[PDB]
Each structure stands twice: as C-alpha cells, then as structure tokens.
Amino acid sequence: KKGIAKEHAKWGPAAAIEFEYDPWNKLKHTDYWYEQDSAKEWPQSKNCEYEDP
Amino acid sequence: MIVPVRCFSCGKVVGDKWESYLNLLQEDELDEGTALSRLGLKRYCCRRMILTHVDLIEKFLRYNP
Amino acid sequence: KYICAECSSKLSLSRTDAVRCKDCGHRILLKARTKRLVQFEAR
Amino acid sequence: NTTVLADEFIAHRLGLIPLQSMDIEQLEYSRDCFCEDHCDKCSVVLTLQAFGE
Amino acid sequence: SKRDASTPLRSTENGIVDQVLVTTNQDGLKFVKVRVRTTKIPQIGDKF
Amino acid sequence: YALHDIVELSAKNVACIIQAGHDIFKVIDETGKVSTITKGSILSKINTARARVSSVDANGNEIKIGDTIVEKVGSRREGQVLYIQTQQIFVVSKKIVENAGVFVVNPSNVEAVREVALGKTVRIRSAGYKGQLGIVKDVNGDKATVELHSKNKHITIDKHKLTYYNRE
Amino acid sequence: MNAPDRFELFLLGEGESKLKIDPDTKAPNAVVITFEKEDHTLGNLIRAELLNDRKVLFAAYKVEHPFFARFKLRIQTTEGYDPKDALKNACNSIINKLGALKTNFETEWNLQTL
Amino acid sequence: NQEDSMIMNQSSIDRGLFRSLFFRSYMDQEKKYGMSITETFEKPQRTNT
Ligand SMILES: [Zn+2]
Ligand SMILES: [Zn+2]
Ligand SMILES: [Zn+2]
C-alpha cells in the first residue's frame, strides 16, 4: 500500500541524508574538544575546501 | 539467519551484496575492509552490519526439515 | 491431517487409531498447518 | 509455508524489500479510496512461490 | 458424563501457535505438546 | 425447602413459603390464601434465578425478579419481587413481619422504584486496520471486539463495516 | 500490549480539528495555535519564517510530549496586526521559497548531464 | 536516558533492531485415574459437560 516512512521505516526512500554547514568554526556554534590543539585533533572536513579559511 | 534487508542505522539495502561480499572474500581472497569498500559501503554502520552478520540459516538448513 | 517427522508423508488417520507412522517406526506424528487463511504484517 | 524460518520473520523481511514507486503520486492510499479487498487502484499485489527439489 | 480438562492459554501471554505434536508416553498414554511462537518488538519498558 | 422458596403445588398453582419446616410448610398462593401443606404436596422447586419470567407494571416499565416495587394503592408496601406469576407477583418486604413479609400483589397495582459475527474471521473496511484479518471475540452492542492476527491487541470496531469470510 | 496507533500520529482523529486557535491573556495581541498530528518539521519552519518578519514580536513553538503528535505555537505581534494574517503571509512566503528552490534544483539537474 | 536509561531509535526498532521470537511449550497427558478410565482429546460440544 501507499505510505510514508513515518508509519514504518520500510517506506524510507533514502538511507542516509548527510547534512552539514559551517565547516570552519566561523559561527562558534560548536566548541571543538581539544587537549593539545583543536586543529590537530580534529581533521578538516571535506567541505572546508569550498570556504575561505 | 539471513542478512538484514536494510541497515538498522541508516536503512541502506545491504542484502543484495551479501552474496557478492562472500564471493569477494572467497573468489578474490580480499580482506574484509577492502571488499566492503569495493561493494560501496562508506558509512561504518553498513560495514559492521555486513561484517558482524552470521549465517545461521545455512546451519538450520543442514537438518533434514 | 497428520505428517511424519522423518517420512513427511500424509496419514489422515482418524480417532481410535494408532498414532505411529505406517512407513517407519517413528511416531512423532507432526500435524500440517491449518488450511485457514492467515495474514501477517511487516509492522 | 514449511521453511525453518517463521511467517512473521519472512513477512518482516519482505516488508523491507524496496519496490518501484516512480508513479506513487498516481497511486492512492487504500484508506482514502472507497474500495474493498485491497483494490488494485490503491495497492500492488504480488505472489511468491519457492521450493527446492 | 465428562468434565472439561482443557489447557487454557496463558492469560497474560498471547501469540501464534507454531507447532503441535502427538505421541505416546512410556505407558502408551496419548501425549500432546503444543509450541506457540510470538514476535516481540523492543518497547520502552524492555530492558537492555 | 427453605424460607421464601417457590413451590409448584400443581401445574397451574405456584406458592411462596412463609414458614419452612421439616415436613410441614406454610405457603401463600397466588390468590393470597395461606395454607399449610406437607412435603409431598410440593411437586418441585421453581428456580427463580433460572426462571425467565417478566411482567409489565402500571407505568409500562419492565419488572424482573428481585426488582424493588411499591404498591400504588393500599399501604404502598415496598419490597423486592421474588417470583412473577401469570396474573400475580410475590413480593417480600423487610419492613413487614406478617406472613414473613411476603405478599401477593397484582402487577398493575405496583410501580418500579445470537451474534453471527462471533467466531468468524473478518476483515475491516473503513479504519486504520482495514484489510487485516481478525477474530471476533465478543460484541457489546453496536460494536464488535476483534483480535488482530498480526497484532497482540483487541480493537472494538463497528460490525457493519466489516466483511466476513469463510473458515478457509 | 497498548502501543500507540502509529498511523494515528499523522492522521487526524474523528471529530478533531487540524488547527485550534485561541486567545492568550499573558500579553496583548497574543494568540495560541494548537497544531494536531504535526511534528517539529512544520512548526520550526513556520516559527523561523515568522521571526524573520519585523512586525512579528514573539513566536515560540512547544511540544508537550513526544507520545502525542501535537504542538502549540504562541504568536504575538504589534497592535492592529492580526496574527492569522501574519501566519498566512509566512506560509505564502514559505510556499514561494519552496517553489523557487524546486525550480532551481530542476534547472540545475537538467543542465547537468548526470 | 537518565538514571542509566537509554533512547532507542523507533525506525531501527521497526526495521529489525533487537526483535525477538518467544517460544512457549504446553504439555498435556491423558494420565489415567483408575483402570479402564482415560482422558479423551476431543472438541467439547457442551453436551453432558
Ligand atoms: Zn548503514
Ligand atoms: Zn515415518
Ligand atoms: Zn482501494
């Protein structure tokens, strides 16, 4: 029968929907957890190349 | 028994590649990670779903019934 | 109405009758599933 | 059914099986259309038969 | 002439009957064993 | 026989005991006459609980065994009906000691104070579980309780919107 | 044994209104809109659109309990501005933005061979 | 998830996560109480019962 994924996961048309924004810590939304250096501990995201450091 | 139809975490369909996964492990003698990467599994959820699965259906079918 | 565990052959025995398989000495005498319609949902 | 598996188990596995839904908009929910016995106008019917020899 | 001695299903449990078998005991008396299978899905109250 | 028991004196005579003895019983008949009889004069005991007898009062409200009624005329005696006769009703009152509180009054002089679906597989039509097999357990009137085969729950749904199927 | 009706989450119940608008006495020109069988998806978007409007003063959405598919949006605007008009304008703006996004995505997909 | 509690994904739960099968077996016998008297496995018909 016709249905939506909300009723049951079997109707889910998409498996993984990756959503990201603000690769570089510009808006200070996330405070990276660091012990020695924040940049070294956390590798740069793939999308970082699309924004000015 | 059988490989899960969809990944528990994301829901990606991984049951199609289970036979392909076994063939790659046996026919090509490839390691687990390389075979899974070739099959097209990026997220580790599907990686652990396929790697951690156990084929108890074959064991059950060994009996006469 | 009944089947053998090993032979898996129908018996269709009635009341006041032996419950042992006719083909073999085994007498598990399992019964087949009901003919009534049965429905299940993935939910 | 006489497989080692269970009817509910196989039904759940079948439920997760993807099905083509390109024309899902044309299809109507069963709960909406005034039908009886899952009319094809709101449902898709398939049959599965299998046994070793 | 006779009194019913059936085995009622558990009040707090329900499910789909999976199998039923009939055999003879050591003394030859009729014996029946019915296995009922149920599908239980995780819920809030379930413990992990 | 005990007190207040109903005794079938004959094919058309029914009496109520007001004094239960060993072999001697004092009984008031449908006509209100109180007489003393022996144990052999009683053909059998009428079971009030199993007796499906009903009458119509002056107001038209149905009255059954055990219902409390009050006489419209006379002393307005209030009491519970023990048995219903074709033309009379026996009423026992706790406020009356005479005749063990049992009196026979006319019904018109007092005022009161098969499911085919059951046991058959069905499918719902207009609901959230339409097309789902279900087994009917009981009906409370205008609504039928059905247990779903695939769900361990009982749901009440109107029977008119359900389609019945054969055993197989 | 008594799990909630999964279909009921996104389906309106018998004799139930989709939206229930009532006045709010906490502040002047304040209204409460109860949305039935709705999740954060629509409420958050509507609230964000409302906040983007200068005339809108307060717009807050609250979900009472995860069990019930229902939430309540409190909207307060300036004097002389009916909250329903602001909500309608926000919905129209959301529709226009969604249509523009769909058109742009279709154009981009058509431009790309893959 | 407080007090060591946990939050489990409903989608995963309905998609095949930690689903279980419970099997319960009931046994019945025609144990004889007195010679020449034994139980009978038949559907009751409400007659003489
Ligand atoms: Zn996955
Ligand atoms: Zn045999
Ligand atoms: Zn239809």
Identify which of F151, F162, F155, F156 has the alpha carbon closest to the alpha carbon of residue F117: F162
User: Residue D20: left (phi > 0), alpha (psi -120 to 50), or beta?
Assistant: beta
| Tokens 């949006």, residue located | G73
Under 8 Å between Cβ of F1 and F16? no
Classified as helix, coil or strand, G11 is coil
Which residue type does F110 have?
V
Report long-range pairs for F37-43 (Cβ below 8 Å, ≥24 apart). Answer: F37/F9, F39/F1, F41/F9, F42/F1, F42/F7, F42/F8, F42/F9, F43/F7, F43/F8, F43/F9, F43/F10
Domain enclosing residue G34, as ranges: 1-114
Q: What is the rounded CA–CA span in Å between residue A47 and residue A53?
A: 11
- Domain definitions of chain C by residue range: 1-43
HSE on the CB side for D45, CA within 13 Å?
A: 7
Q: What is the per-residue burial (b if ≥16 Cβ within 10 Å, else e) of F7-28? A: bebeeeebbbbbeeeeeebbbb
Q: What is the rounded CA–CA span in Å between residue F40 and residue A31?
A: 102
Q: Is G16 exposed, middle or buried (0-12, 13-18, 19+ CB in 10 A)?
A: exposed
What lies within 8 Å, CB to CB, of D44 at 6+ separation is: D19, D27
To one decimal, the resolution in angstroms is 4.3
A28, A31, A34, A38: CA torsion to nearest 10: -20
**Count of domains forming chain G:** 1
B and G make contact (3+ CB pairs below 8 Å): no
Q: What is the rounded CA–CA span in Å between residue D14 and residue C40?
A: 11
Q: How far is G4 from chain F (nearest CA, A)?
A: 11
Which residue type does C7 have?
C
Under 8 Å between Cβ of B41 and B35? no
Which residue type does C27 have?
R
For residue G32, what are the β-bridge partners? G22, G74
| Tokens 């749904």, residue located | F157
The CATH number given to B1-65 is 1.10.10.60
Dihedral sign, CA of G80, G83, G88, G89? positive
Dihedral sign, CA of F154, F156, F158, F161? negative
Q: What is the rounded CA–CA span in Å between residue F84 and residue F76?
A: 19
Under 8 Å between Cβ of F63 and F54? yes
- Domain definitions of chain B by residue range: 1-65
Chain D hits for C38, CB-CB cut-off 8 Å, are 7
Is B43 in contact with A16 (Cβ distance < 8 A)? yes
Chain D interface disruption, residue of F123, F124, F130, most D CBs within 10 A: F130
| Tokens 């899960």, residue located | B4
Q: How far does residue A15's CA lie from ligand 1's centre (Å)?
A: 7
Under 8 Å between Cβ of G39 and G62? no
Which residue type does A27 have?
L
Q: What share of chain F is helix, strand, coil (3-state, %, to 5)?
A: 10, 45, 50
Full 3-state SS string of chain C: CCECCCCCCECCCCCCCCCCCCCCCCCCCECCCCCCCCCCCCC
Q: What is the DSSP string of E10-48?
A: PTT---EEEEEEEEE-TT--EEEEEEEEEEE---SS---
Q: What is the rounded CA–CA span in Å between residue B57 and residue B22?
A: 15
Identify which of A13, A10, A29, A21 has the alpha carbon closest to the alpha carbon of residue A51: A21
Q: How far is E11 from chain C (nearest CA, A)?
A: 23
Residues of H with CB under 8 A from a CB of B: 9, 11-12, 15-17
Which residue type does F45 have?
K
Q: How far does residue C28's CA lie from ligand 2's centre (Å)?
A: 8
In Å, the largest CA–CA distance within chain B is: 40
Element housing B61 (H / E): helix B56-61
B and E make contact (3+ CB pairs below 8 Å): no
Q: How far is D53 from chain A (nearest CA, A)?
A: 32
Output the CA–CA distances (angstroms, integers) from residue G96 to C43, E2, G42, G55, G104, in the order listed.
37, 79, 15, 20, 12
Classified as helix, coil or strand, F107 is helix
Q: What is the rounded CA–CA span in Å between residue F125 and residue B9?
A: 35
**CB count in 10 Å sphere of residue F129:** 20
Distance of CA F46 to the CA centre of its chain: 13
In chain A, count H helices and then E strands: 1, 0
Q: What is the rounded CA–CA span in Å between residue C6 and residue B65?
A: 8
Pick the CATH number of C1-43 from 2.20.28.30, 3.30.465.10, 3.20.20.70, 3.10.105.10: 2.20.28.30
Q: How many CB pairs under 8 A join A and C?
A: 3
Under 8 Å between Cβ of B53 and B60? no
**Tokens, residue A48:** 């970082």
Q: What is the rounded CA–CA span in Å between residue G105 and residue G100?
A: 9
| Tokens 């429905």, residue located | C39
